[PDB]
């Protein structure tokens, strides 16, 4: 598991196409914060 890694913070768009990009995309679209809101 080497997720995150070569995909940093970005909002909207189709992304970078590495890792789980597809799965984070719909989460980010339906709700803000595709991955792990900052504390």
């Amino acid at each position: 598991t080497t997720l995150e890694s070569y995909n940093k913070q970005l909002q909207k768009g189709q992304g970078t196409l590495i890792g789980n990009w597809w799965e984070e995309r719909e989460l980010r679209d339906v709700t803000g914060i595709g991955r792990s809101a900052h504390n």
């Binding site: 070569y6 995909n7 196409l17």
Partner: protein, 430 residues
């Protein structure tokens, strides 16, 4: 995702990369500060192939800079897009090789290679999907010609199944900038033939003839030469980084261009090229693109492509166009010049189409050709080498650092056999 790591060594390779990375950066819309500012979403679509992301969203090239003297990187760091390069990857020597291949491959190299091999291992293991390696260097410079081929040997030792690509600036006798080219060039090529999956040769004199005749500009410069090389190289991997009608990656080219495991030396060309004064009259059409591509003088190598028969050819087009026109033009150029294609291999041209053209041009073409024409370069360098070696001039310097004439003899015999069996298939018939 089928990613490649950039490693460059020697002054020539450093200068080549200094503008190759600039071309990649402005094509992908990356500022010298590492912040993306492009307009098309396809720009970030496959940015993976050459970049890494650090915290804060900034991008860094996965290129490792190597040499035996720090002046080169001290110069290129102040240049444009010099801030992209990661400071840790810089590996430089303390003495210098002085264009002595034995020094650069046996004494200084055996000690220096540890850090560079460690860092390249780190880069390889960090990347998820490694496609292969690409290296830029010149066969006339000692430190490059030695330590680069040493790194070739070792990297191929731990990664036998991956593809590897070599960018060799082979010296021509007309424009000779150094005296000991025959020795270090033949020593480098002896090792390079055994371990190179792909090797493409570049001639500075051919570059200069192209820029003087086609571009018709009065004062050419190393900047323009580097720009030509960088554009040619971006053309190679545009198809791997952008969608198109028919994608064909590096392994695709390796399968479709190398008939026998040892004939893996190529000559390249780029199109279109027009002068600033005539650019408004030319109309960009596939027929004239192909006519310029298959021009003998447009090739970036000294070898006369009409002095031999093509083993195979490959053309990568960039931009939107009809593939039927491409195919019919390919058939026309094949059957019209059947004299210059060896007969026992029908349909010996690979054609690939990518839907994203270079910025500022609506269509572009890159050409890679495997032909018998390269034999004369090796014949002539062999003549220069034997002229050097009969009188044993400039030889005690090499042999005083662990070398002997046995290595020179075996290398020249190997390269002579290379030339002989390279020309063997030119006259072979079915």
């Amino acid at each position: 995702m089928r990613e490649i790591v950039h490693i460059q060594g020697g002054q020539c390779g450093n200068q080549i990369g200094a503008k190759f990375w600039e071309v990649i950066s402005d094509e992908h819309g990356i500022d010298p500060t590492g912040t993306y500012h492009g307009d098309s979403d396809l720009q970030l679509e496959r940015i993976n192939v050459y970049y890494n992301e650090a915290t804060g969203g900034r991008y860094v090239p996965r290129a490792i800079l190597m040499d035996l003297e720090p002046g080169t990187m001290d110069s290129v760091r102040a240049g444009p897009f010099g801030q992209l390069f990661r400071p840790d990857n810089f590996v430089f020597g303390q003495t210098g090789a002085g264009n002595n291949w034995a020094k650069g491959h046996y004494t200084e190299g055996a000690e220096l290679i540890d850090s560079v091999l460690d860092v390249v291992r780190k880069e390889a293991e960090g990347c998820d999907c490694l496609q292969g390696f690409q290296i830029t260097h010149s066969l006339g410079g000692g430190t490059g010609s030695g330590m680069g081929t040493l790194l070739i040997s070792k990297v191929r030792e731990e990664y036998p199944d991956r593809i590897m690509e070599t960018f060799s600036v082979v010296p021509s006798p007309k424009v000779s900038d150094t005296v000991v080219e025959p020795y270090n060039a033949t020593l480098s090529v002896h090792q390079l033939v055994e371990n190179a999956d792909e090797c493409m040769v570049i001639d500075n004199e051919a570059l200069y003839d192209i820029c003087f005749r086609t571009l018709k500009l009065t004062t050419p410069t190393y900047g323009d030469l580097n720009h030509l090389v960088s554009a040619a190289m971006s053309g190679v991997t545009c198809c791997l980084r952008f969608p198109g009608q028919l994608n064909s990656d590096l392994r695709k080219l390796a399968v479709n261009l190398i008939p026998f495991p040892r004939l893996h030396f190529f000559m390249i060309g780029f199109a279109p090229l027009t002068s600033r004064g005539s650019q408004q009259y030319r109309a960009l059409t596939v027929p004239e693109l192909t006519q310029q591509m298959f021009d003998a003088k447009n090739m970036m190598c000294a070898a006369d492509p009409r002095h031999g028969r093509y083993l195979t050819a490959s053309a990568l087009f960039r931009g939107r166009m009809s593939t039927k026109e491409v195919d019919e033009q390919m058939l026309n150029v094949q059957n019209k010049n059947s004299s210059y294609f060896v007969e026992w291999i029908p349909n010996n041209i690979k054609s690939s189409i990518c839907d994203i053209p270079p910025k500022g041009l609506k269509m572009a073409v890159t050409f890679v050709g495997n032909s018998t024409a390269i034999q004369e370069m090796f014949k002539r360098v062999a003549e220069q080498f034997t002229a050097m070696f009969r009188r044993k001039a400039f030889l005690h310097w090499y042999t005083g650092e662990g070398m002997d004439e046995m290595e020179f003899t075996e290398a020249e015999s190997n390269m002579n056999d290379l030339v002989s069996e390279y020309q063997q298939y030119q006259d072979a018939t079915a």
